[PDB]
Amino acid sequence: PSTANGGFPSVVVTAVTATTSISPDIESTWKGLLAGESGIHALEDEFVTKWDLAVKIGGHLKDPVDSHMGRLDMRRMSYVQRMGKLLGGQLWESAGSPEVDPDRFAVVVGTGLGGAERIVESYDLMNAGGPRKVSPLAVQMIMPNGAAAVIGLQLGARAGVMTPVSACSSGSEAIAHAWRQIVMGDADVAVCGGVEGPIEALPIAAFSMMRAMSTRNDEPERASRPFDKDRDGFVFGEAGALMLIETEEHAKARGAKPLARLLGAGITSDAFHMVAPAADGVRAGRAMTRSLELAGLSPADIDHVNAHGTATPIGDAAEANAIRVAGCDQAAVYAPKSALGHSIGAVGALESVLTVLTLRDGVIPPTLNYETPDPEIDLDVVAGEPRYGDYRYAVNNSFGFGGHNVALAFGRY
Amino acid sequence: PSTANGGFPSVVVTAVTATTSISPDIESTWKGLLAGESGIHALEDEFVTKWDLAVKIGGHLKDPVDSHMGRLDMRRMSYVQRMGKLLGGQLWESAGSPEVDPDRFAVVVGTGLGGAERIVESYDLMNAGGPRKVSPLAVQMIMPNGAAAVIGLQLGARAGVMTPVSACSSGSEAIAHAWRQIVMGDADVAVCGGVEGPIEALPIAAFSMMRAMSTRNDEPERASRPFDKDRDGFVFGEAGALMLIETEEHAKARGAKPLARLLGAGITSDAFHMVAPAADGVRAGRAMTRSLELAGLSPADIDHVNAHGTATPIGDAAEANAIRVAGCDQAAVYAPKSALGHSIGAVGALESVLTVLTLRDGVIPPTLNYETPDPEIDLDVVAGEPRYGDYRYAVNNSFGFGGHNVALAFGRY
Ligand SMILES: CCCCS(=O)(=O)Nc1ccc2[nH]ncc2c1
Ligand SMILES: CCCCS(=O)(=O)Nc1ccc2[nH]ncc2c1
Ligand code: NA
Ligand code: NA
């Protein structure tokens, strides 16, 4: 059973929303990427000077989430819940505020951590003034399912509200499980994607101490160099992203105009190391292969790979091997983290949206900062200018610390 | 397509492990439950008197996890990772240490929160000594996918390592997704269940400020009273639980004797309330109904319901409505939280293991403290002494903060 042979129902993407370091408007982010814009800047936050952080670069959201939040929302929600509410509302408006069957409507939203700032706040409040100073709302704000739960309540989804956690692949895994919920017949429509917290001193310290992060502070826009010989780790770029998926029949019935098809999803694991990806890229490649099996595609059908491409030395080398294992090494490769940086639990969802726009508009943006090819990579990296083409099929790659591999197969509508 | 009509492959439970407030040995926990034992005691921890907490009762594990942890494991893992590794090794030994195909072997382990104590440790270390006092190991211990990742790495699972988070339903949802991973053909064998952190001062503060917890401190063993007129909220009872599931053909090939059949799983959502179940129990009932649809069973086939039964006023009232909506109100009901208390992200997995043992041994333990049945609830709650009966099919119910409903349909082997 496959999408191609009608074993699974046809599933279409009918709306997308994202907030990024370039714009709060996904169409403006898209136009900016195609024009070679970067969201990465010098961090002006006082915490950089306070701690003299080795990393002094990153992409804050162009439009901060809390500029849209009233006093009640600031008191009763964690940051990722506030981001979830904002994007959920925007997505539903973009979809024409459809009246769907709540009992056939699912939400699947991944995140890296959850309402972690409310853990440290509760800890500090209790140490200061005892247990009665902890908010009655602490549990519902902290719990990592909090963002999915807020969006489910907001939009009226009664066919399941789910939160997969797999670190940097959480946002893609959410879209994978939303696809599974529809093709298994539990839902006809799903809001899915990923949200993530902002750049702060403790997050920078934790990832910096792994030596995972770029310290090219003198030239912030040149720091994120996926697949480049001179890469030195990832750059934080804040983001959140949701898409609306539904059966082709459901979309047709309400006169929704599909952006793309979601054809298949592959989830595998390395069982190799807690943070290092498997050097051979075999299980990562097999995630890509599994997405093709469920789609009913061959590797020769794949015109485009949206790479995980974090710009770590070991990460990009492993992914180049994975793309070869999957037989997709003739595909045009884009690494959006070159321009938008790394949003951890959100980034797979953001890159899924970018993959949909590539197929909709028949264009791949340039991988920024790709100036010196690495002999170990040997990929067709899109660079210098956007690449226009009749792109029919694309795979979005997303890999997570812990050895989690998620590949999503998309088709042009 | 159903288990009954052969649309899904037959999936069997071949091993179980759990650590509880009664015993570190699941077979000894089971004998203790049948003897009418409670794991709930007066908390003797210094932190109770230090903070003068409103809740002074709970079930610590009979055998603490860290009594089995050497210095290396204490330094490189969060608590839920240490619990995960301990149970992972115990389960594999119980299964006869099988040599399986790593590329057909999945891990799905739920948890409520993750390595949260390492967030507050990292925060304290940075505030005291700056960013270079944060461990290179912090991210991999903190990340909520950490416990599943540790078990995947320990046992060599390369067909996916997944962590669903849905608060009190996480452990059941993990078993649901493991069943999905097998019936969709991604894996032939899966380790699945739930782990959760210990009873500490901040957890008691956060949950007790929700006003959801029993304050019957003078009679700890009498505090947890699911479906009783005098119930006054839930009691913490520490646990972790894993089961090994595989296709019946995979079990037969290696000569594994199944303990039970896992027939189907239903996941729905309320989209009503953030911390309480919907009073009408309709979506919770639909999760039970969905599990029966996928199993290919009718409500009349269900001999036993292992209730969520948290002993909150609203929880037990809503669940009584859910069981009636699902047509299962003639089933024999057990509320194990009466004896073992509430282990949040682990409890759905623990109660799934108890459902398996009920079917294997044809016996339901007594629901403790069921002395004045609630006049507004009419369920067949097993109480007094264990009920020996011809239990062919059972549903395990789990509900989670955020409006999550998970039902698992099990069959006698
Ligand atoms: C793109 C930057 C991401 C940093 S993260 O991975 O640490 N996520 C995160 C989650 C919750 C948070 N609350 N407050 C800060 C914060 C950061
Ligand atoms: C049955 C007791 C559950 C309490 S919890 O839900 O708060 N879980 C939890 C998770 C991580 C933790 N790290 N340190 C303490 C701790 C507790
Ligand atoms: Na990608
Ligand atoms: Na139960």
Tell me about this structure:
Chains A, B: Residues 8-412 form the Ketosynthase family 3 (KS3) domain. Chains A, B: The active site is at 168 (for beta-ketoacyl synthase activity), 308 (for beta-ketoacyl synthase activity), 342 (for beta-ketoacyl synthase activity). Chains A, B: It is found in: Cytoplasm. Chains A, B: Its EC number is 2.3.1.293. Chains A, B: Pathway: Lipid metabolism; mycolic acid biosynthesis. The PDB classes it as transferase. The structure is a homodimer of 413-residue chains. Chain A has 2 domains: 1-263, 3-Layer(aba) Sandwich (Peroxisomal Thiolase, Chain A, domain 1), CATH 3.40.47; 264-413, Peroxisomal Thiolase, Chain A, domain 1 (3-Layer(aba) Sandwich), CATH 3.40.47.10. The longest helix of chain A has 16 residues, at 79-94. Chain A has 14 helices and 15 strands. With 413 residues, the first copy, chain A, is α/β, with parallel strands linked by helices. Chain A has helices at residues 26-34, 46-51, 71-76, 79-94, 116-129, 138-142, 146-155, 170-183, 201-208, 248-253, 282-295, 313-325, 337-340, 347-361; strands at residues 11-19, 41-42, 57-58, 105-110, 161-162, 189-194, 240-247, 260-269, 304-306, 332-334, 363-364, 380-381, 387-388, 393-400, 404-411. Chain A is globular. The two termini of chain A are 21 Å apart. Helices cover 34% and strands 18% of the residues of chain A. Chain A has an 11-stranded mixed sheet with strand order 5-4-6-7-1-8-15-14-9-10-12, with helices on both faces. Chains A and B meet through helix 5, helix 6, helix 7, strand 5 and helix 8 of A and helix 5, helix 6, helix 7, strand 5 and helix 8 of B. The complex binds ~{N}-(1~{H}-indazol-5-yl)butane-1-sulfonamide (2 copies) and sodium ion (2 copies). The site of one ~{N}-(1~{H}-indazol-5-yl)butane-1-sulfonamide has 15 residues of chain A, from helix 5.
